[PDB]
Design a binder for this molecule. Structure first.
Ligand SMILES: Cc1cc2nc3c(=O)[nH]c(=O)nc-3n(C[C@H](O)[C@H](O)[C@H](O)COP(=O)(O)OP(=O)(O)OC[C@H]3O[C@@H](n4cnc5c(N)ncnc54)[C@H](O)[C@@H]3O)c2cc1C
Ligand SMILES: Cc1cc2nc3c(=O)[nH]c(=O)nc-3n(C[C@H](O)[C@H](O)[C@H](O)COP(=O)(O)OP(=O)(O)OC[C@H]3O[C@@H](n4cnc5c(N)ncnc54)[C@H](O)[C@@H]3O)c2cc1C
Lengths: 477, 477
């Protein structure tokens, strides 16, 4: 248990029913607090948003998209993957939300980059790119070792042990050269009898180095990205519908746009508009999970230095676009089941689905880009986003990328009402971050921006748990 | 698709209802042949065997094991994982067999003996990789900066390589490996000022001499690289699906073949079923019985064919599953699927890819081959279990010994109607392999041993398809 049972009558109003708000309400309710969550949207989960057939969104440009994905088909417009260390998985267990493997690494997906080489704009599988990169890297280090370049730092035994590893890791010849590998894959698959197949031949060392084909390999090592990774079966939002059901819809007001938040003699008073009607609620404490750039728009009595600190959390651009195909060509032709292709093009990456394997249709994430390469889509209409996504995807996966398209749906977080950012990028552990960990009398801030895991649910959930613990200790005092 | 309808009446007898035999029968039927499969066991699938509650097996030593795993819990005693290029996935699609396999995991352990302080110490894959690639990258950058590779790299190549090594190894600005977040954390980063605490790096010489990177290249195997897949509920679901499409009226289970002879009208096969000596004659035969077992049959095969069969030498491999009543690997070690790897006889410990976050699970406590399976072969199941738990506790601690519900083991060189895990051709195509691709009048051999994917279902399936195609083309003239 996070906290013991609270003694007596104590109330909290939670602004925002995203992960931080719902986790806060869930934990406070467990401990016997009166809790009310106010959520502006008509769904729980905030930046955890899963697009399905029937999903409708009007963005800040006034464009309305209606998703028409087939029944059971979806994609996560925000949060989609979870590493093994994150408390998100603990909450999936607590809430009974089934998880499955998320394909965050795949030998068969492509890399495709521009360079001053003949590989420029050429798709190469990860396994081929890795085999060549690690083949030549191993050959070079073995050559230096054999030449005696590392004799001041390696003993004879160290050199022998290193050489053995390099021959294995690089699949080197008996004489220490990278000459290609079955690890690159096959143009024709090995079968039965005298059907030996045909190994894909290697690129030259100079091509490999000058193409930068290994620029994305270290992504595999990210603490929060390395396999194994996980995701909820049927969409990430299922975590937050599960929180909703545990909290009870009697304790959550949806379509409740908070317009004011003030410390008052009785506690904290929050005004909000719901169903076009003006409402007010007072509680002993408030947990404010509204994104920090949006908090200043509220009528408030926050001190100037708090308002200034909130502005240090700069908004960030990020967006996704999903295309439903009526043929799973990536599985049938490319032998790609999940994972992502990676590119320097604006689309940045193409993410293949982790469910309905071998089915008749599926949703591909045609782009998931951030920063400059999302600013390239942000101001386009959805139709224009789609056209650009298809063109760039076809340059990676061929003309099949353009065929068998059923429908599509995009989100761009900086243009999305009640988000206006994918995640915070603090100016400059900063003084503004540290300032916003302190309560403003009876108002506490929580969210992924006030964590060391920004842009992870873990950050939101651990922030909620810390803030609930602080309120509980204060009530005890 | 494979073949397009046969004209008139034609019959085939298939010896063995493993993957090659069932695939053969399935495709022949689709083309309009009369087919009868003779299978010695009471289950379809052969070396594709899934142990669940109720499984009973008596091995060639006379020991009977009775599996008592909880409903819905199982493990694959033989085939368990499938790469994306294999036709096994295409048959899963055709048969409606749902797929979901963790073949790489940053959080599982490596544990090897060495003349270092890491000897017999468990190290996570992510820590072992970060240190290995960190120091490897530092050393290659050092050699490059020194000028050791000036005769093979240009100035611009050196700069491009240095950039890659900095990021691949997570080197400091001055080119040293000093640790990384990639190693993981002793305390997880959370919210506020809860930064967590990184795990500190091992020293260079220790890392090199420990051999903790000796298994990293497994990640790159053409048939092992992620993404990998497996059928939901067990690998044997593929072969129960074949069984149901073929029809149990066309399969005689508990049918021990004792004779196979070319005769005037085709091939006559004698077998014992229901205690009775039976005979069947068909136009053609497809013999999928493992090659070392074929010689035991009464037959009229030419001497050179009998000699060729003996060149396919049998091999030792086996597995042992333990059902735990607590998923400690998930709750304590944050391991969700994947395998720990070791030089101990157990060889590896494979964690389950289903029932994530649930209350119980089956761990494959060993999967070993060759000498390291010969260490288990002659042991009783009780002795196998004791050895598995002893060696496993040396890797995963005392928790490995607790919450044990039940267990079940297979050793393929002691298993009736297998007596081998897979073949190794002496001289490894070899002349004996080539010889056995030829029909012996109306008798065709098929199986994974007559493929370039031995010890894969793909090998058995492509062998079946090739043999069915040969028969069809011969029937067509
Ligand atoms: C593109 C993208 C990719 C991501 N990738 C991952 C990933 O793969 N895995 C992962 O774990 N996380 C990922 N995340 C991060 C994850 O979505 C966030 O960490 C999490 O949603 C943060 O929760 P929060 O409660 O702090 O904020 P939010 O989710 O933003 O919730 C804030 C809530 O406040 C509400 N609100 C705003 N204004 C008002 C108002 N005036 N009145 C009432 N309510 C209001 C909003 O509607 C919203 O529901 C991703 C996010 C994005 C957008
Ligand atoms: C330990 C182990 C691990 C494996 N790992 C993988 C993996 O992860 N993925 C993968 O794809 N493959 C794997 N395989 C390989 C896979 O199991 C085989 O490739 C496949 O089972 C071979 O099919 P087959 O039809 O050639 O032979 P078998 O499966 O051996 O079938 C032969 C059949 O002949 C029958 N038979 C024998 N004698 C008689 C007789 N006298 N009369 C009647 N019938 C008889 C047997 O009962 C059996 O059903 C593994 C196998 C083992 C044992």
């Amino acid at each position: 248990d996070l906290i013991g049972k609270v003694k007596g009558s104590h109330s909290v109003v939670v602004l925002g029913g995203g992960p931080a708000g719902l986790c806060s309400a869930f934990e406070l309710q467990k401990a016997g607090y009166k809790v009310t969550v106010l959520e502006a949207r008509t769904r729980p989960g905030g930046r955890v948003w899963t697009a399905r057939g029937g999903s409708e969104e009007t963005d800040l440009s006034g464009e309305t998209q209606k998703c028409t994905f087939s029944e059971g088909h979806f994609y996560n417009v925000g949060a989609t993957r979870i590493p093994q260390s994150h408390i998100t998985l603990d909450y999936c267990r607590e809430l009974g939300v089934e998880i499955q493997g998320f394909g965050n690494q795949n030998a068969n997906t492509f890399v495709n980059y521009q360079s001053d080489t003949s590989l420029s704009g050429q798709s190469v599988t990860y396994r081929a790119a890795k085999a060549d990169t690690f083949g030549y890297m191993s050959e070079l280090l073995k050559k230096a070792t054999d030449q005696g370049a590392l004799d001041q730092v390696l003993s004879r035994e160290d050199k022998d042990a290193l050489s053995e590893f390099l021959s294995d890791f690089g699949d080197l010849s008996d004489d220490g050269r990278y000459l290609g590998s079955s690890r690159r894959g096959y143009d024709s698959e090995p079968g039965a009898g005298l059907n030996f197949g045909t190994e894909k031949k290697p690129f030259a060392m100079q091509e490999v180095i000058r193409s930068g084909i290994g620029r994305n390999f270290s992504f595999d090592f990210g603490y929060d990205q390395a396999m194994m990774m996980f995701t909820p079966v049927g969409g990430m939002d299922r975590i937050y519908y599960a929180f909703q059901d545990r909290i009870g819809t009697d304790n959550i007001v949806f379509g409740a746009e908070v317009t004011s938040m003030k410390n008052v003699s009785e506690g904290v008073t929050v005004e909000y508009t719901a169903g076009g009607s003006k409402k007010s609620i007072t509680a002993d404490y408030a947990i404010c999970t509204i994104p920090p750039h949006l908090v200043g728009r509220l009528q408030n009595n926050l001190p100037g230095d708090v308002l200034t600190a909130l502005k240090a959390a700069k908004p960030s651009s990020s967006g996704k676009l999903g295309i439903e195909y009526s043929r799973r060509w990536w599985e049938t032709e490319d032998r790609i089941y999940g994972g992502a292709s990676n590119t320097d093009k604006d689309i940045s990456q193409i993410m293949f689905p982790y469910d309905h394997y071998n089915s008749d249709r599926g949703v591909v994430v045609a782009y998931y880009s951030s920063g400059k390469r999302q600013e390239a889509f942000e101001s386009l209409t959805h139709r224009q986003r789609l056209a650009k996504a298809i063109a760039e995807g076809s340059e990676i996966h061929g003309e099949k990328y353009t065929r068998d398209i059923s429908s599509s749906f995009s989100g761009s977080w900086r243009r999305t009402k009640y988000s206006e950012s994918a995640w915070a990028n603090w100016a400059g552990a900063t003084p503004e971050y540290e300032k916003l960990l302190e309560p403003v009398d009876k108002i506490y801030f929580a969210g992924d921006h006030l964590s060391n895991a920004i842009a992870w649910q873990h950050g939101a959930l651990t922030s909620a748990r810390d803030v609930v613990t602080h309120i509980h200790e204060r009530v005890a005092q």
